[PDB]
Amino acid sequence: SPNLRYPIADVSGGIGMSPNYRFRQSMWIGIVSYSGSGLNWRVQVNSDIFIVDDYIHICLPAFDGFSIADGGDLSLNFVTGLLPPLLTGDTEPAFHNDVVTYGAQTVAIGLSSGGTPQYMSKNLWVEQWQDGVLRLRVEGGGSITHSNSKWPAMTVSYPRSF
Amino acid sequence: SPNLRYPIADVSGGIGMSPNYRFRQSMWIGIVSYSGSGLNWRVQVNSDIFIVDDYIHICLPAFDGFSIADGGDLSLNFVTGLLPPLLTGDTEPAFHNDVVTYGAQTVAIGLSSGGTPQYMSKNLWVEQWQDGVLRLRVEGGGSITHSNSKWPAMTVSYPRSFT
Amino acid sequence: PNLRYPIADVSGGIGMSPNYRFRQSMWIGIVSYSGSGLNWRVQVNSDIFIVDDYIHICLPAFDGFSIADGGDLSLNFVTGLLPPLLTGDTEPAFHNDVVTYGAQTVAIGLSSGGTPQYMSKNLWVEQWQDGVLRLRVEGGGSITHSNSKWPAMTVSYPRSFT
Ligand SMILES: [Mg+2]
């Protein structure tokens, strides 16, 4: 109705909440890039996206990468790979390009040289979204000599811009 | 207020947001079951449930189980044990019975055989809800030889169905 | 119409208050540990995000002293909140109930000035009382140590609306 404003909407002939606001599902098939202490690699991932109320959730699957540093960045390039009609701008946080420490959590990453991984307890958080790239910080928990990393499934969530 | 549709509701004579939508508390007294690589066991938990906006949160307490595999499933049976007037259908995700990797997190589980536990950081996620049973994947982090598992308190959350 | 927050006038129609959807603040305050006769405090500068019916407290990494196998981490919201946020704004929707909310893994580095050993502890929101939020931190075993390296931790819970 012309006298209602999204997320408020006509719901079977009355005043309700837009179903689209309550739950929207999408997908990202795209590139995750790691950078830290001169180490750089990238990997393609298939990830569900769920937008629920004023939050976005990016459900990353387990993946394998190469060497990581004590501290580093994991970057999700949303500039391509989003399933239409979801656009890059739809992934911008409500704090826009502010630098933050949002949703900080433990992530166990298995470091190896081909053999039995040693799992390190690292600290991950959403740090910054900039020009359609979501940057996550991954640091702490110490490290070992390794050439491969086994990354767990990780859900990345934050407040979405409206 | 025939013109209104939940979660929009009459609030002190005007148009507001239903308090029931904003916060609801409940309880599940029920059975958590583990299955992985031919290992099966179950325990009872008494767990708070919070429904807040379009999310449901299941606050599992710490519990003790037996042997686990490198990878396996932890299943919560919502068919029984929900506090009235909550029903089994109330726990269906907004992605219904789709197979997902939602709310993936680290859980540290203490593995022992009567002595001091070794804590394994494993990877847990909501995988699938089917006919009132919520299936959580628990994998990764390696393992040791063990007969007993000490599970931490874990909160499991996901967007909740509304039609 | 007679609108009731968070329903509010938006651009001439009935919509959702932007304030309900996203609010960003800060808490510059004192975090106190207590367990088994151990007591210490630190200063934190932390972002607060209020999004829909949730509050998120984004604690930065900090260093403290000895911890017990089980103990309490307490956030003093009586002071330090950035105006116009007030202490009452941090009350959970379960008010002063004792709960086990948002239980998660937290890896904490225990040392005596040398290389930390990281212990996977279990943290949850336990109770808010008179402007003090009590978090429980237990499990994962322990070692003899004089210092603790705490990771960045985000603490979230449903927020009271009165
Ligand atoms: Mg106590």
Automatic annotation (TrEMBL), chain B:
Domain of life (superkingdom): Viruses
Organism: Reovirus sp
Domain Outer capsid protein sigma-1 C-terminal per the UniProt entry, residue ranges: 1-159
Localization (cell): Virion
Entry protein name: Viral attachment protein sigma 1
